[PDB]
């Protein structure tokens, strides 16, 4: 897992039907780092340092193991620096 | 020859009543209790009947008269 | 009070006993006595609602067997303003 | 004398016989006669409580046979102040 | 003539027959004719006690047959002074 | 004349009709129509004795089944002067 | 007209229905209503002989059912001059 | 108000009760109370045809059990002009 | 008057009703109320012999069914001067 | 008068009847009325041994049937000086 | 308010609960409590008759199961002037 | 008037019938109509204790079959002083 | 007119159809529409007693099967002045 | 003396007879009469032991019959100093 | 009660005649005192005659354009009976793609090619030139 | 346009979708949405009778499957001038 | 303290253990002990509601068997302001 | 000592015997005697707990069969300060 | 006090019976009444923790039977400062 | 953003959760939250069609287990100009 | 903090206890209580997610058995800026 800031709220209305519709949040290793993206299982507001799980861990983090997620947000660091 | 209430022979001067003495025989009554002065010769309830206690120890008004005679504005039941 | 007590009887002797019992029993004012005709005589006691019910109850038992008897004993807690005109306001 | 003795009769003739008997056999004043209508006539006599009882038994016996006869004979020991308004004050 | 003589009848026609028979039989004055109500009419004559007994007896027989009939026929030889105030003085 | 014929009737329809029959049949003068109360209504005519007898027979035959009926039909050929006071002089 | 139509009926409610039916169903005029006393109330109409006959029959049938009901219904095609004194005469 | 609604009754208690129930039930004015005599009391209520029908029907049910009950309960949609003379304009 | 009318009852409540009906029914003064002890309460009235008799009979009937009941209802027409001391002169 | 007569009773009504009969019968002064408690009332009189003998007998017959009755009736011709202390000197 | 409602109980505890239930229930004024003796304790309230009825009914139910129970519950819609001298009064 | 009659109903049609019945039955003022929510409407009346008792029963009977019907019918003869703050004073 | 008609419904769609059938069927003015809560909508109309009866019957039939349906359809020929304070004078 | 002869009786009359017989028989001194309450009246005497025994037996025999009777009869040859504090010292 | 009656009976038909049992507070009531789960039909069950607006599956109520059987005209006999027509029995043979969804297609021999053949048996729908599956 | 189209629904979301379809389907104007309460929301359109029929049908099928559903879909081709007042003229 | 706890017991020995147990268990101030009469003693305490409830429970349990038992045990958390007068302010 | 001892009895003769027995047996000080009323008499004797227990046993046995018997026999080893007020501190 | 008591009830009628029995029974003050919606009316009374407890059991028994019934009854020994904002400060 | 997302729910907690899930999932302006009545709360959003679809799908799943579920979840790509009037602009 | 603690219950009494428990358990500020309608009452607190997570668990347990029950209990860690517009800021 890794602490990553939320930059914006990604929207794709032509995504695979297997995704159902979880929230999506563009994530930042930090501002100025690659804008990777996560399925926001734990609700996070833009401008929030949020820990993101990855691999098969991200998939069962969302509804199902078959769920198509490589990065999921599994929390928000209560206080982060 | 005198006895106490519990059966103690008292053997000396007797104040117990005699056939030949007349002034003494005013009472041969067990009713005298407490200290015993003469020889052979449970209470659990008030013995007076205070009248309030004798009487076993709903509303009576102008409104309880004329039960069927009256017709009128109906009052809540 | 504006409640109306009414005791009609088959005579005046049963209506005066009724009137005495009604006025004595409760705080109700004897507004009038009306000779209806046919021998019927009516005594009215306007007062409060609690008082008028008690008054009409006392009047009923007292004169039920006086003379012929009591033809009617009726309680109206509120009489309409229109009926107030036919009502006798003061006794004669 | 605040007691009131009323004798009702079916006609004026028994009433006047009753009023004659009531005033003759007690210290009871004759406070008036009432025509109730339907034939009933009410003769009211007011005096002492004992005298009124004497007047109304004497009156009842006198008029129990004359005419249609006695409808009611009632003795009211004290008359409330309100009732006195509907009562005949006095012919005098 | 202190003595009074009253003949109540069930109707004015019987009463007028009675009055004619009473004032014709003896020297008595027709003091009054009252309408009691309910069909009852009374005819009173004040006269000497002998003239009243004779007049009332004659009046009773004459009007017994007339109309609905005779209610009562009563003679009072002396009326109390209180009873005089409820008696008609002059006919109307 | 002064003969007084009088037909009492139960109600005023049998009286206003007996009066029409009595005044039409013979030469008699209708002197009054008195409401006795109780329903009775006495219609009096005053005329010659022969005419009054004819009139009352006419009035009586006419009002027998017209209504509730006739209470009385009496003829007094002369009336005492005392009786004049209670008799109606002119009709209303 | 001269013809008279009287409808005696026990109570003022049947009398008012009868008067309404008599005055509406004929050319008669309501001369007056006379409370006979004893419960009876007469309603009289004066008009032409033909109109009065229709008025009485219409009034009789209408109120026979109303209240206590009809006591009498009579037509007098001509009333003598003497019998027009004891009538209501002018309606108002 | 035009339609007359009349409830006759035996006594002034049944009639005052019926009158309270008529004026309360619908928009009708109490135009008067008439003592018909014989113990009959009439309560006349003038209002629109619909209001009168509601008032009389409510009064009929209310006074049926009160003492001696209703003798009549007639509803006249429009009384004739002549009949208005004999109707009471206002209560006394 | 000087006659004495006493009613002893079991409790204050029966005594207040017995006293209320003694002073309402008849013309008797309430001279006092005594707590005997044992739950007995006497009610003494002083007045005329006729008034006291009527008062003591009204009071007795009124309190027989109130609470524990009536023990005594006695009338003494004349009380000796020695007995006057134990009597309550004025109500307390 | 040193002799003491005492009538105990169950209530003040029997006691007052007894005191009345005792003071009326003979010349004995009512020296006290003591409320024993539990409903017992004792009336005491002091007089001549003959007057006390007559008084208590009369009181005994008087209160036996009045109220609850007579608990006791006693006559002592002379009381010991020490016993006189407990006796009431005057009726309080 | 003149009407008086009194609840008599065997013991002080039912009486105080009665006086609490009677005063809270309706617009009655606790004038005072009387210790009759023998255990009887009467709580008297004074107020308008309808309010007193609501209070005396409320206080009876309140103290009926409390302690020994109820001896008597009572209402007097009007209390005579003489009685008020023997009533606790002194609400203060 | 302190007594708080209060008739909760389901709807404003059962509440306006009940309110009409309550206001008509006795001398009570419609202090306020409250929309509780969930389709409950509570009409509150305030009057003397007897007038409130009569009004509540009349309102309960009138609207029991109107619309959904009666939810509750309660009479508080004297509400606490703290409670008076929450109760409505004039309908809004 | 002062008569009040009232169609309660479950919803505004059943009430507008009831409101449209009532106003079209008879001479009634829609005085207000009230949202009771709990999904009840009461449509109140005013007008003559006969007209209001005609409007309510037609309105009830039209909205009986519109949406959830009719809860109540009531007519009050006369509403007390106190109830008029909870009635809306004109709609919004 | 120090001994205490007591005789409790059901009434003051029995108690006074007992006290009279006790003070006369022996040299005992009446030390006081105590009203226990509920009808119990104790009589206490104090003198030499032999005298107290003679007085108690004489008093018990004399007043056993008198009135309700004798509850107790006790002799206490010596009373402890502490008991003398509750003992009545002397009537004087 | 006697006299002019405003009470409701059948012969004098009108507004007073309707809603007996729903009306309350009427002088008659006071004397006495003394459906389908869905507005619209099941979608699958009913195929509407005219679709789109003009659908009748929804029970629109009150002043709607629906005409009941008693109302006659502008439909049925009034439109159909106007013009003479005769339907003839035609051998109905449809040659189209939907009809040819089930034409007999010959047995498809798979691909026995091996080695760097991207062919997947799931993707055998494809045919290569010469009619060779895979 | 005068015809009124109504689609009651359970909740705002079915109502907004219903209004979306009704305005899109036909040329009708959304005169407003009223939150009836109890979770009912009414969407109102006013337009031509033909157009409103299309809008009501279009809205009814759209919102049936959206959310809780449609309580009712109604049309009023001609709204009376009296209904107009309670109809909202324009949401904005 | 406002809450009043009252244990009435037949005799003072059962009311000294009732009071010993009552005071000890909780912080309560013994306001008074009252001999009602007839063998009844009422120990009253005033304090906080929690303390009074715990106290009277302790006192009632302790005296149930001591001597004669407890006639009553009662808790009134806020006796009305009128009832404060009859409650003893301090024990004597 | 601080312990209390108590022997209620039905009379003053059993109470005095019990007091003598209690004081003569052990080192206990009679602190007084209270007349409960109803016949009950309580003896309160204080001292060391062991002495009081022996004294109470001796007291109960001495007076168990004398006069009316024993009611209560209680021992409190320590009483509260509040209880001291109701207790008689000094013999009297 | 700072403790908070609350009684939710379905309807205003149960909430006022509950509020009237809460303030009457124990030492609590109505701090306000809020209409929750959906037919629930929460009552709040604040006072000493024992008084608020006694008020909420008394109130719960009072309104469980009145109206629909009692949704909740609760006591908060001490209320945090933040929550006090949402609580009603006072109806005053 | 023209498209209107909506998510009706049975309560506010489910609705606020849905709104948090809708605004976090996509860039959509939460235009308003509406309390529909009867427990229904509708949170509306306005944004691009793709953003609205992402939001309302995200909100529906998030609030589908939060207490009572989602009544509905609706996506409108294009909203008519008429509908925009009832749509909230800014949260209130 | 920014996290929102939400508890919806079925009544105000379950919500206030829930809010007492939420504010008491952790340092969370009560930012408002909303009345959803339909009986649902929501409480909102704003504090750090640790405080909101600890508080909500406490409130959900505290009101689980209180009143009707708990409908929802949710924790949002970070409430989006857009949703903050539909959150109460301070209690009303």
**Concatenated DSSP letters of N18-50:** HHHHHHHHSS-EEEEEEEEETTEEEEEEEE-HH
Contact O24 L61 (CB under 8 A): no
DSSP category for residue F83: G
Pairing of strands S3-10, S74-76: antiparallel
| D35 DSSP β-pair partners | D41
Residue P1 contacts T, CB cutoff 8 Å: no
Residue K84 contacts C, CB cutoff 8 Å: no
Phi-psi region of F60 (alpha: psi -120 to 50; beta: other; left: phi over 0): alpha
Nearest CA-CA distance, residue J66 and chain N, Å: 17
Residue F32 contacts G, CB cutoff 8 Å: yes
Distance CA H39, CA H41 (A): 7
Overall size of chain O counted in residues:
134
What angle (nearest 5°) sits at the alpha carbon of residue L87, between those of residues L85 and L91?
A: 125
Q: Within 13 Å of residue J33, how many CA atoms lie on the same side as its CB?
A: 25
Distance CA A56, CA L34 (A): 61
Distance CA H18, CA M75 (A): 21
Nearest to L39 by CA among U39, S40, S39, M72: S39
Residue of K nearest to L54 (CA): K50
Task: Say which residue the tokens 């045919």 belong to.
Answer: O127
Buried b (16+ CB within 10 A) or exposed e, R38-68: bbbbbbbbbbbbebbbbbbbbbbebbbebbb
DSSP category for residue A48: -
Structural domain includes residue S38 = yes
With a CB cutoff of 8 Å and minimum separation 6, the contacts of G77 are G2, G3, G49, G52
* Range(s) of the domain holding residue Q44: 1-85
CB G16 within 8 A of CB H8: no
CB H70 within 8 A of CB H21: no
Whole-number Cα distances in Å, A53 to A1, A42, A81, U79: 5, 11, 19, 22
Pairing of strands E74-76, C40-47: unpaired
Distance CA E65, CA T19 (A): 110
List chains touching B (3+ CB pairs under 8 A): C, H, I, J, K, L, N, Q, R
Structural domain includes residue I92 = no
Contact O24 M50 (CB under 8 A): no
Overall size of chain S counted in residues:
92
Distance CA S62, CA A10 (A): 60
CB P70 within 8 A of CB M13: no
CB F28 within 8 A of CB F55: yes
Structural domain includes residue T26 = yes
Residue of C nearest to D6 (CA): C13
Structural domain includes residue E25 = yes
Structural domain includes residue F23 = yes
Distance CA A67, CA I26 (A): 104
Residue H39 contacts O, CB cutoff 8 Å: no
Task: Say which residue the tokens 């003992």 belong to.
Answer: N87
Contact T21 A23 (CB under 8 A): yes
Distance CA C58, CA C19 (A): 9
Contact L16 M6 (CB under 8 A): yes
Residue E76 contacts D, CB cutoff 8 Å: yes
What angle (nearest 5°) sits at the alpha carbon of residue I37, between those of residues I31 and I41?
A: 35
Residue of L nearest to S46 (CA): L82
Crossing angle for the helix pair J49-64 and J12-25, to the nearest 10 degrees: 140
Pairing of strands B71-72, C70-76: parallel
Overall size of chain N counted in residues:
92
Structural domain includes residue L91 = no
Strand order in the sheet with E3-6: E28-37, E40-47, E3-6, E74-76
CB M71 within 8 A of CB M10: yes
- Any contact of F with K, at least 3 CB pairs below 8 A? no
Nearest to O29 by CA among G69, M60, B63: M60
With a CB cutoff of 8 Å and minimum separation 6, the contacts of A25 are A6, A8, A9, A10, A37, A38, A40, A44, A46, A50, A73, T24
Structure tokens at A29: 């290793």
Distance CA S49, CA S86 (A): 20
Residue B46 contacts N, CB cutoff 8 Å: yes
Nearest to G13 by CA among P25, H9, O36: H9
Structural domain includes residue D91 = no
Resolution (A): 3.0
The neighbour count for residue P79, using CB atoms within 10 Å, is 19
DSSP category for residue U22: H
List chains touching G (3+ CB pairs under 8 A): F, H, O
Which residue of K3, K45, K47, K50 is the best one to mutate when testing the C interface, meaning the one whose CB has the most C CBs within 10 A?
K50
CATH code at position I32: 3.30.70.1710
Nearest CA-CA distance, residue Q14 and chain S, Å: 28
Task: Say which residue the tokens 């009677």 belong to.
Answer: K22
Which residue of K7, K8, K12 is the best one to mutate when testing the Q interface, meaning the one whose CB has the most Q CBs within 10 A?
K12
Nearest CA-CA distance, residue H39 and chain B, Å: 20
First to last CA, chain T: 20
| U7 DSSP β-pair partners | U43, U73
Method used experimentally: cryo-EM
Task: Say which residue the tokens 């903090």 belong to.
Answer: U1
Contact K32 Q85 (CB under 8 A): yes
DSSP category for residue O43: T
Overall size of chain D counted in residues:
92
Structural domain includes residue M3 = yes
Maximum CA pair distance of chain C?
34
Crossing angle for the helix pair S49-63 and Q49-63, to the nearest 10 degrees: 80
Distance CA P55, CA O65 (A): 12
3-state secondary structure of R8: strand
The per-residue DSSP string of chain C comes to --BEEEEEESSSHHHHHHHHHHHHHSSEEEEEEEEEETTEEEEEEEE-HHHHHHHHHHHHHHTSSSTT-EEEEEEES---TTHHHHS-SS--
Structure tokens at O93: 């043979």
Handedness of CA C62, C66, C69, C72 (dihedral sign): negative
Q: Domain count of chain J?
A: 1
Nearest CA-CA distance, residue P42 and chain M, Å: 7
| S4 DSSP β-pair partners | S46, S76
């Amino acid at each position: 897992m890794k602490i990553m800031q939320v930059e914006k709220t990604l929207v794709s209305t032509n995504r695979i039907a297997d995704m159902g519709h979880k929230p999506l949040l563009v994530v930042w290793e930090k501002p100025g780092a690659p804008r990777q993206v996560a399925v926001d299982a734990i609700g996070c507001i833009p401008g929030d340092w949020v820990l993101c799980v990855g691999s098969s861990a991200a998939r069962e983090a969302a509804g199902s193991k078959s769920y198509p997620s490589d990065l999921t947000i599994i929390g928000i660091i209560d206080q982060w620096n | 020859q005198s006895l106490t209430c519990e059966g103690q022979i008292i053997s000396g001067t007797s104040v117990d009543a005699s056939d030949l003495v007349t002034g003494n025989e005013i009472g041969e009554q067990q009713l005298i209790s407490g200290d015993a002065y003469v020889g052979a010769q449970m209470p659990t309830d008030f013995s007076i009947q205070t009248p309030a206690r004798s009487a076993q120890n709903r509303i009576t008004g102008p409104g309880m008269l004329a039960t069927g005679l009256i017709t009128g504005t109906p009052e809540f039941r | 009070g504006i409640a109306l007590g009414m005791i009609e009887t088959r005579g005046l002797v049963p209506a005066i006993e009724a009137a005495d019992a009604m006025t004595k029993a409760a705080e109700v004012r004897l507004v009038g006595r009306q000779f209806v005709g046919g021998g019927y005589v009516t005594v009215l006691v306007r007062g409060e609602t609690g008082a008028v019910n008690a008054a009409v109850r006392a009047g009923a038992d007292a004169c039920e067997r006086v003379g012929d008897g009591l033809v009617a004993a009726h309680i109206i807690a509120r009489v309409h303003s229109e009926v107030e005109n036919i009502l006798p306001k003061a006794p004669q």
